[PDB]
Amino acid sequence: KKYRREAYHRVFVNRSLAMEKIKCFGFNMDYTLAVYKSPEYESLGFELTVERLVSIGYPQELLSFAYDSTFPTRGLVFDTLYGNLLKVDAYGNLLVCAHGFNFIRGPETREQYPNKFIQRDDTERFYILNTLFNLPETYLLACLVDFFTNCPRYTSCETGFKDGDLFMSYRSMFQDVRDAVDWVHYKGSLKEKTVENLEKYVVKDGKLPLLLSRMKEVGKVFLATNSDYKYTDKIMTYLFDFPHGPKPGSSHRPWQSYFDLILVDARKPLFFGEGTVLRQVDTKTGKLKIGTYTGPLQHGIVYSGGSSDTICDLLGAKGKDILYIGDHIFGDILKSKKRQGWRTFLVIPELAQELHVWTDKSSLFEELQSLDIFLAELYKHLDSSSNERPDISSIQRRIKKVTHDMDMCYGMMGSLFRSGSRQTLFASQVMRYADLYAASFINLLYYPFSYLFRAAHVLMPHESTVEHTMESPLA
Amino acid sequence: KKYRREAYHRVFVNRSLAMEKIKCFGFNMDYTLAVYKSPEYESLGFELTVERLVSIGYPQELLSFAYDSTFPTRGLVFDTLYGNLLKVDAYGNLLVCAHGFNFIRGPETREQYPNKFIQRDDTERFYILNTLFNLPETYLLACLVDFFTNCPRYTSCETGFKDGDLFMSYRSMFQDVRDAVDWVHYKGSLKEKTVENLEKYVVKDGKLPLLLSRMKEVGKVFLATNSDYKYTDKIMTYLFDFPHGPKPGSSHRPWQSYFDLILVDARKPLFFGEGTVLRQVDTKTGKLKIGTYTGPLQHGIVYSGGSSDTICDLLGAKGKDILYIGDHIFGDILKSKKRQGWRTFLVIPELAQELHVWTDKSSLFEELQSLDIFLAELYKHLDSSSNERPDISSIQRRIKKVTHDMDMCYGMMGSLFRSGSRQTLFASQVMRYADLYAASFINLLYYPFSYLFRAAHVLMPHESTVEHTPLATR
Amino acid sequence: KKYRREAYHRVFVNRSLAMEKIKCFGFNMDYTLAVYKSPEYESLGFELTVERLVSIGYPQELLSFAYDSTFPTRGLVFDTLYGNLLKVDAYGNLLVCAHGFNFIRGPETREQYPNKFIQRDDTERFYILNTLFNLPETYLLACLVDFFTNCPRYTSCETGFKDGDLFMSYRSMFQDVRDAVDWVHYKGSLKEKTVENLEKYVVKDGKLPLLLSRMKEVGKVFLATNSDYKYTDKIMTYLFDFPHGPKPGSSHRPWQSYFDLILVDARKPLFFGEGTVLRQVDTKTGKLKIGTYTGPLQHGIVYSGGSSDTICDLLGAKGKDILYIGDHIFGDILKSKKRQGWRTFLVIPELAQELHVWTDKSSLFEELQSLDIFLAELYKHLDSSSNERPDISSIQRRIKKVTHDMDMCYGMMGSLFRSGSRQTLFASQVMRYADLYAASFINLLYYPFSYLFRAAHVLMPHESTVEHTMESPLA
Amino acid sequence: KKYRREAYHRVFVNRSLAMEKIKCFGFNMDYTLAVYKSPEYESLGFELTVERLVSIGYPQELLSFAYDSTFPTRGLVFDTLYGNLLKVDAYGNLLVCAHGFNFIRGPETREQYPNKFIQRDDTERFYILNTLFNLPETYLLACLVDFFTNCPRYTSCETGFKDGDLFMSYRSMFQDVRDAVDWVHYKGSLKEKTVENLEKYVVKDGKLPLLLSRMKEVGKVFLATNSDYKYTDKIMTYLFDFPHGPKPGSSHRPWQSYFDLILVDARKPLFFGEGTVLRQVDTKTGKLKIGTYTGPLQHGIVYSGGSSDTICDLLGAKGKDILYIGDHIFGDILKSKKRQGWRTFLVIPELAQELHVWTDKSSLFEELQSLDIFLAELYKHLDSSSNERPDISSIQRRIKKVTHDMDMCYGMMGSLFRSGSRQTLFASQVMRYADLYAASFINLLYYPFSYLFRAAHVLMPHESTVEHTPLATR
Ligand SMILES: [Mg+2]
Ligand SMILES: [Mg+2]
Ligand SMILES: [Mg+2]
Ligand SMILES: [Mg+2]
């Protein structure tokens, strides 16, 4: 039995990585350093989207919607043609299909998805609700479908609803939701009401300055956020407001002092390709300077826009010397660039409450391995030369009821990573994108900066189920 | 603790499937029912390929190439620009790079692959050697690159070789190979020289009729082959040449009696699309009837062309009622069609010899496992508080040396499924396409037709490494 | 001698077009139906951009800039690396190169453009000021380069200016201008001050309702603008405010009655590809309805967003039955679409004042054809067997001075279509994009709707200079 | 009213150029100094190409193809997907579409080209037959398409032809043609069979030495050829075989005496890039010296490889001081390099025979011109006020019939420069690349080296159709 950190502190390794060769730690801000509290933050976002939808003309019944965190799972696929929330596997196959709040079973899925299959490439048809900000709109969409479906004033249709002489399609409707969320995030009052009560909305943890401290003793540390500087200063100042610096008794110091480079208005994902013009920010006003200091790496400066390359020049680093910590899954379309890629630490908040299910619901996992063992015993001496057709309909039904019992410990749309046997599309892009992942980057605090992160083998069927311990010539 | 059949007998399960709901069993012919022997069939293909390249104008020194089955591994990617054979992962990442027979260590790869990544979505540059018929040209490609790179009279360049004034691009060369193979399969003598010594080139097992007789007992059985009839009828005849039928003591019967439906000239994968026009075959002349028997089905008939939907109408079955046994992996583009798709049994010959390494080298698997444990012990009481660098350099080189030895027990280009901690593009295409897999379809013989095939869970780093026993919690 | 309409009324034909086969006339609004008066509109745009640049920190001397229409020619290329306005030919060759207000001659161009050549594909380096709205920023850029170049406070550099410890590059500076223009057009007060005094800014012509009238007697007529509906209603109402309808004595009627389809918020050029969702507009509020009427072509409706295809369905038309009148040159990247392309009428306002030069400055054209004739006479009997090297330096100098005398009748950056011998890049895309062109679409008023628009041959050197009236076997 | 030389003697001017500033004259060899005779050299190439395709495996009926110089026109685009030869305009637009020898009228083109447009920026689909060496395969391509489409034993498809079971894509076929040509030029017998009857295949004119002797008098003259030396030295020798030197009565002298610099094996267009390594050639053995004479220049030397910049250093001249005479059009990608580029003289053989139509068919040009006038008269007093449809249908069909007759005076695929009111992709590539053009470089003989070459204005619809005599004015 090999030693492993306690489960809640671990950094999970998809591809091996020698920490010693890391010269730079980069940081996302939103949902990486600034972990927005849950359900509270989603409920805020949700409410501001409903109100904005009502002001543009939506029916007042929407004001009755209250966000329910137990419904959405991140990563779902909205089908703007059929108004369905879909949980797909890595290869496009349906796992969960719910219309509004109505969960469709296998046989009925074949009416609209005759081969239980969607074409995820059809960017026109489907929208992947991949991001922690997409959480409220995921519930909102089910709500609106559930509402209009059950409200007498409207007639339900394959692709939407009839409202007298009018027709709101699930696709027209989805765009309203999408635009409203954009409006809430940009011209709206989300960042306003967030800053006006940070205790309510943003987690504060005092190990965060400690961790960034030791990072800077052994490497360079930078920040590259998409939010403007006025919003960053407010959120970063609160994350560092303690009556002491990194360790207690020591003097507090500004948050800018924990970074060798600070960049705002990055404009990710375009940041990683050509970029934008590299600007510098007057920190007094939070407004761009007209000129821009170009030269060596001196501090006090806050850069705006730019590109991933620009960061690499200023820090004096090759790509693979940069570990980049964040909450987003940047597509494999930037990996193509002949530039050296950044290493990756992906933050997946869900991980915490799912590692809980995994350790506290062990009774259900055991009941599954029992029926599985028992089922293999009923066939132990059966082959193609066997008449016998055992009765396994009730034990097949029990396996059906216990995985669903297990599926529901995660939420109404199940685990983020799997549904029963199959891995979800989301876990597929986690494995493709992320060298390292965990629930918070703060888990880096429990590993020496000399650590060797040796990845685990993702075993194939013939690899997990046969141990290392005359043949037909067809083999 | 649970029961599993002998490792070499097992059908391995990717997605679950209940056999009692299987009503039709369909069969590929080449490399499925007719397992071609190895290395002999590769060598014959390789030698007819080289003859053809020499017939076209290539230097005589090629006649001295002989196949070496220990080099090639299925699934490699030839970079026509820089003339390399690559082993890529599922997401485009270089695992192994060899120019000719010269293996390129990580640092060097950064010259041509600065980011150790290829856009496998670039068919004008890369050609994925996916098929069992691609092993010879995988090696032939490496032979030629090594030859033209070490032959005194040719000069090496980034993208090909100078023959004096004249310049041959690895891409131009690859087309010559790629067409020479096409020629050997389609216009040359391969199919001909195979029939004339079938006992050298084709495996024969009496378990095959036995297994197909028990299928016809509980369902309909069909054959959907890309080969023509003159060839199919020769190869199948041999496969059924025993002085007895299915069980021993029993009168032998014709191979055609084992299939409720026989279709040749399928033009798969166009078969699964619009297809071609359904044609009936004159069993005698080995050629086409002017008409076709549409409507109902009756035995004695041999179809040509058609589509996968034609088979579903004639067999009277829905898509998921069909289990299709074969050796090719048809991409995800044929699933999209609003038809109900077939359940799949993929045949992976390599599996037999790869299941030997996994069991007969349990000494390297256990050495690596001990090295990992010892590594965990050296960092047990370390965190970001401590700033000590334990010396892992000895441990590390030993790891890299044992996994390369484990890698070489598979062959010169590693295991068909993985290279180290990383899965190949092949393995990922296998788990995308295949419901069930095994070294031969014959393994179905060891299972009842009432069997419940329950998928193996493909665990994640945070599921395989943790027991069931506020910046994160939000 | 063939008959031709008087020069100011003509529609110029690049590719032949049978008007009889046109079932639909489509319309741009901004700078097509709403011709913004010049210099007045450019001066407005220019002033609002300067003020916005000053509020973000530009030096107050800018408030002294006054727009001068005699400087810019549409279609120039800004080089964000060297801060130069460039007038290029179809193939990338320099014609005019001015830095600020300083016009560089041949030999000095080879310092920065050693082969008198730019790579127009380098979208990062160069910006093509192709559009009638880009006019103010074209002068503004020369101004800012001229300013900072000559102001003691700044030091001039190859790629910008030093301002103490700072460095404003011509590329950083260009982005400020570009963003400011965007700001003026969108969140700014351009559309506000335009609507608040339409007599000042938008031409009113009473033949415009007459022309749209006869169009609708013989075909369907539609409008597809990028401006929102509140702005369209204001501009279209003024264009149609006369105390009478199409012909005088007749009753005035609304502008919406001149159209079979009205579409706003098109989002060209994306309009011509996949598009956006097709919405419908509540004309009372100028705000989108929640649902959208789908069905046959009934009137009173005003559609929003959509796609070129959507228009084709509703009008019942194939692509080549649609003549589309506008002021923009849509790239050849939408021509690719397997969709049938629209026919094109390109509006080029400049055409009016340039056809003026062509007819009023005939004395200069004649002086050129004289020196040209005279020059060919000095060589009449000269061949490779000739010692004689005539003296043509003063007549070469006169040709240099008269084309420049001619070049300047167009403006400080010369004609829009040519500079001396060479055609400009702009005329190249005019010929590629436009089936028909003229100074206003209103010239359609002088052609019957049965007219055959037979295009003119663009003659090659060996075609214009040899008439229809023993050889070396090398030919 | 102004003076112009005889139409067949003229250098035509695209951009202006003053000859007295020309210090170096450079020469291409094949199709420039060595004008290959027509149709004979096309036929020889065509026949060796077909022999090679039959040697490889193509049906014997090909041996009955014979070249027809009246079909092909340079600049056509072969669509490998649908097997068509296309004549496109400058912006990608179909002017003429022929499948085999079947010409496709507008309406039919809309099946395969719904928008009568091709993305010529798609080299995997289209191949632009730009060069004088491409005429044979232009016709060969059409021959094969027509053959396989009308041969009883082959079946036609959208994208190729079935040979029974086996399927050949027009794209696969095109590679066979394209390489068979490559073979004939590079490994076969073309260069060989040309030397053995030079008086059949290569034009000879005594004006050539005369013209090159007057260049060496007022500037430096060099030769930069892609051919090797054994070939260049054979072809040039013949070009200078007269019982006298430049003027008559004067001692003949060697061809090498006419060039201050001779460079073979140029590998143009890589020549204009980084290039290859500069090599000296042993004049005797026809092979390479182990060294190279770097530094200064002296006569007697023959260079190999190098780059365009090497020539500028050795000749001691800047780019715009060089006028480069040749028959190829090197794309806009070589101009971008921050070097000073060469002034260009493009040689367009076709020009001679096309300047005959323009002058000897002045009857159709005048009929069309009258039809246009009459058309203008029928709409003179019409505006959008009048709603009368005059009958133009008679006039219109006559126009379409006379321009097709004017089109056919050029050949079966129209004029090399235009089709009707529209310029070809060829013409636009000519006015992009070429400073001066003419049917042969020989025409320079008819001009002083002090001459001012003044560009012809390429007028626009609003410049050619209007004399110098408020919705628009803003
Ligand atoms: Mg984020
Ligand atoms: Mg097969
Ligand atoms: Mg406009
Ligand atoms: Mg040549």
PDB file of C-alpha atoms and ligand atoms in Angstrom, chain B residues 28-32 268 327-328, ligand 2:
ATOM      1  CA  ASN B  28     -16.582  -9.077 -41.827  1.00  0.00           C
ATOM      2  CA  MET B  29     -14.503 -11.532 -43.894  1.00  0.00           C
ATOM      3  CA  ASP B  30     -10.859 -10.441 -44.257  1.00  0.00           C
ATOM      4  CA  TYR B  31      -8.995 -10.425 -40.905  1.00  0.00           C
ATOM      5  CA  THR B  32     -12.191 -11.494 -39.104  1.00  0.00           C
ATOM      6  CA  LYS B 268     -17.806  -0.245 -46.703  1.00  0.00           C
ATOM      7  CA  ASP B 327     -11.586  -5.747 -37.703  1.00  0.00           C
ATOM      8  CA  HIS B 328     -12.120  -2.196 -38.955  1.00  0.00           C
TER       9      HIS B 328
HETATM   10 MG    MG E   2     -11.735  -6.615 -42.739  1.00  0.00          MG
END
